[PDB]
């Protein structure tokens, strides 16, 4: 066929029930995730091709960057709870990978302050139980698919995108192939 298991995607041997429809994992330490976000705008181009009534979820992971990696998963929970994902994603990536000005939880916080989130609002979210279980949700989703690598995307908890099997000569062409694959998997 044109789309075949093991080429544009792989199938999970152990499917995950009740999973979010389009589930994406990344890390602010992950170099391809940086490309995915600021050069390819993968998440965005997937959304533009998804049927509607479809939710997109994006979660941060712990297994890169040790102590800071965990801090970042909690910060991403704050970002989700406050709905400010679109104002911190770029400065977190560039603070970790471009400028290397993020070295502590306090530097992560500074990015939120500079993006206009209030000090008191950030610290309260950071310390809230609504952020604890949001951290719990991210870890649980990664656990359920035995996640050892990012960037990663899962559709309906049973298909995993396989970017290795898509042409990379052209970046525009890679993105559309990626997005079209998500839509194919979506309708499957």
Is 1-188 assigned to CATH 3.40.30.10? yes
Token pair belonging to 70: 């965990």
- Provide the 10 A C-beta neighbour count for residue 104: 11
- Compute the distance between CA of residue 3 and CA of residue 143 in angstroms, rounded to an integer: 27
Give the DSSP per-residue string, 53-99: T--EEEEE-SSSSHHHHHHHHHHHHHHHHHT-HHHHHHHHHIIIIIS
Token pair belonging to 103: 């070295």
- Compute the distance between CA of residue 70 and CA of residue 153 in angstroms, rounded to an integer: 20
Domain extents in the chain: 1-188
Alpha helices (runs of H) in the chain, residue ranges in sequence order: 31-34, 42-47, 66-82, 85-93, 105-114, 119-127, 129-144, 171-187
Query: What is the resolution in angstroms?
Result: 2.1
CB 157, CB 147: distance < 8 Å: no
**Residue 157 Cα distances to 15, 37, 73, 131, 142, angstroms:** 6, 22, 21, 24, 11
CB 25, CB 140: distance < 8 Å: no
Tell the residue number behind the tokens 């870890």, with chain if given: 139
Strands 22-26 and 56-60, by their bridges, are parallel
- Residue from 163, 180, 76, 168 nearest 125 by CA: 76
> Which strands make up the sheet holding 56-60, listed edge to edge?
9-11, 159-161, 152-155, 22-26, 56-60
CB 95, CB 107: distance < 8 Å: yes
What's the CA angle centered on 18, arms 58 and 176, to 5 degrees?
45
Helix 66-82, helix 119-127: angle, nearest 10? 110
Please, is 187 exposed, middle or buried when counting C-beta atoms within 10 Å of its C-beta (0-12, 13-18, 19+)? exposed
- Compute the distance between CA of residue 29 and CA of residue 42 in angstroms, rounded to an integer: 17
Question: What technique was this entry resolved by?
Answer: X-ray
- Compute the distance between CA of residue 65 and CA of residue 134 in angstroms, rounded to an integer: 20
- Compute the distance between CA of residue 96 and CA of residue 72 in angstroms, rounded to an integer: 10
């Amino acid at each position: 066929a044109q789309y075949e298991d093991g080429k544009q995607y792989t199938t999970l041997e152990k499917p995950v029930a009740g999973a979010p429809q389009v589930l994406e994992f990344f890390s602010f330490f992950c170099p391809h995730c940086y490309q995915f976000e600021e050069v390819l705008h993968i998440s965005d181009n997937v959304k533009k091709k998804l049927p509607e009534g479809v939710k997109m979820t994006k979660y941060h992971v712990n297994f890169m960057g040790g102590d800071l990696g965990k801090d970042l998963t909690q910060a991403w929970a704050v970002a989700m709870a406050l709905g400010v994902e679109d104002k911190v994603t770029v400065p977190l990536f560039e603070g970790v990978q471009k400028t290397q000005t993020i070295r502590s939880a306090s530097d992560i916080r500074d990015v939120f302050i500079n993006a206009g989130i209030k000090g008191e609002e950030y610290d309260a979210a950071w310390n809230s139980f609504v952020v604890k279980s949001l951290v719990a949700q991210q870890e649980k989703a990664a656990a359920d698919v035995q996640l050892r690598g990012v960037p990663a995307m899962f559709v309906n908890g049973k298909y995993q995108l396989n970017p290795q099997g898509m042409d990379t000569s052209n970046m525009d062409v890679f993105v559309q192939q990626y997005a079209d694959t998500v839509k194919y998997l979506s309708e499957k």
